[PDB]
Amino acid sequence: AGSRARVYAEVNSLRSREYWDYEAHVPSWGNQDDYQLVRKLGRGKYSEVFEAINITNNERVVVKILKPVKKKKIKREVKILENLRGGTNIIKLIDTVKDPVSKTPALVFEYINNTDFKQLYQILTDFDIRFYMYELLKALDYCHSKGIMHRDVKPHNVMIDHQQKKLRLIDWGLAEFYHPAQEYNVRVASRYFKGPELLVDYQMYDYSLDMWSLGCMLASMIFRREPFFHGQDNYDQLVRIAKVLGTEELYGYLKKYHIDLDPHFNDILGQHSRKRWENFIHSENRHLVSPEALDLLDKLLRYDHQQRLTAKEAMEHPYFYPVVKEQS
């Protein structure tokens, strides 16, 4: 009874229990032998990702092989992906398969030819940033409307093919279902994308965590400082935030939600004024910054998770009017 979402708060409560009760979900496991692995793309803590071909139809896909011990978490990710089926700009789950002998499970996703913007293709224009942020917002509004927090929004999870102008939000392995008053694990998101709520151990968070992470991505893109808040550890991460947003404002947020700060922060936070967003503008980024962009960013990167724009409210912001007009 400390906090709840401003939007879609009851939306899982209003659905059949089977929608959100992922522990009860019984996936249909197809045959992984239909997929030929071509190339290893990477590895995470509990998964590895390969480029592959479906040999029955010659389609290129990716296969994400799951360490099989984590049964509840597998069911969670599978059920979330099935619920998100057809959602705008959400990576498409094509199948759920197992090796028919070992029974190791794997997820088959559509392939996206991800651009490395760090050199190869094109450095983003103002319009490009608006466009891709708007497309990312569609995916977040969709999943939030579906009662799902992603909880790991960061650039690596936002796959963009800059030649075809396609965007997909990937890696739903940390995603959860939002339920009013539920206390969630704060050990989610990449350090640089963690909202203050996580950093101060506030467990009654909601979809608005994803809006912090998308604000961090907006800042990094318009100002060309990636990641925007570069902490060396979780404590330093909050200090990096406070050096921008201010310490008095942090204390107001803590008092509103009755939050206790870990006392180790006493030795490191200092005293910081709230900075003007215009302080980040210089010759290398001025062509990406506008009054609109700053107004939007200022409404995303707020301590108080309840005062951040929703995905929809962000979509509706003037910053995206040029994109809306072009999509007409």
Catalytic, out of 141, 152, 171, 206: 152
Determine the Cα–Cα distance for residues 93 and 319; give it in Å rounded to an integer: 32
Q: Is the dihedral of CA 269, 271, 274, 280 positive or negative?
A: negative
Q: Is 109 in the site for ligand 3NG (CB under 6 A)?
A: yes
Name the residue nearer to ligand 3NG (CB basis): 38 or 254: 38
- Cβ-Cβ contacts under 8 Å for 55 (sequence gap 6 or more): 34, 35, 36
Q: Is 289 in the site for ligand 42J (CB under 6 A)?
A: no
Q: Is 90 in the site for ligand 42J (CB under 6 A)?
A: no
In the window 252-311, what residues touch ligand 3NG (CB under 6 A)? none
Binding mask 135-154 for ligand 42J (x = CB under 6 A): -x------------------
Of the candidates 279, 291, 288, the one whose C-alpha atom is nearest the C-alpha of residue 318 is 291
152 carries an active-site annotation: yes
**Phi and psi of 293, rounded to 5°?**
-60, -40
Part of the chain binding ligand 3NG (CB under 6 A), chosen from 27-35, 166-174, 181-189, 252-260 = 166-174
Q: Is 38 in the site for ligand 3NG (CB under 6 A)?
A: no
Q: Is 288 in the site for ligand 42J (CB under 6 A)?
A: no
Name the residue nearer to ligand 3NG (CB basis): 85 or 287: 85
User: Judged by CB under 6 A, which of 18, 21, 31, 44 binds ligand 3NG?
Assistant: 44
- Extract the tokens encoding 328: 């007409």
Q: How many CB atoms are closer than 10 A to CB 65?
A: 19
Report the phi/psi class of residue 201: left, alpha or beta, with left for phi > 0 and alpha for psi in -120 to 50.
left
Name the residue nearer to ligand 3NG (CB basis): 80 or 238: 80
Of the candidates 169, 173, 110, 109, the one whose C-alpha atom is nearest the C-alpha of residue 137 is 169
Q: How many CB atoms are closer than 10 A to CB 243?
A: 16
Of the candidates 261, 122, 116, the one whose C-alpha atom is nearest the C-alpha of residue 200 is 261
Binding footprint of ligand 42J on the chain (CB under 6 A)? 117, 124, 129, 132-133, 136, 155, 158-160, 217, 221
Binding footprint of ligand 3NG on the chain (CB under 6 A)? 41-44, 49, 62, 64, 91, 109, 111-112, 114, 170-172
Binding-site residue set for ATP: 41-49, 64
Binding-site residue set: 41-49, 64
Question: Which residues have a catalytic role annotated?
Answer: 152
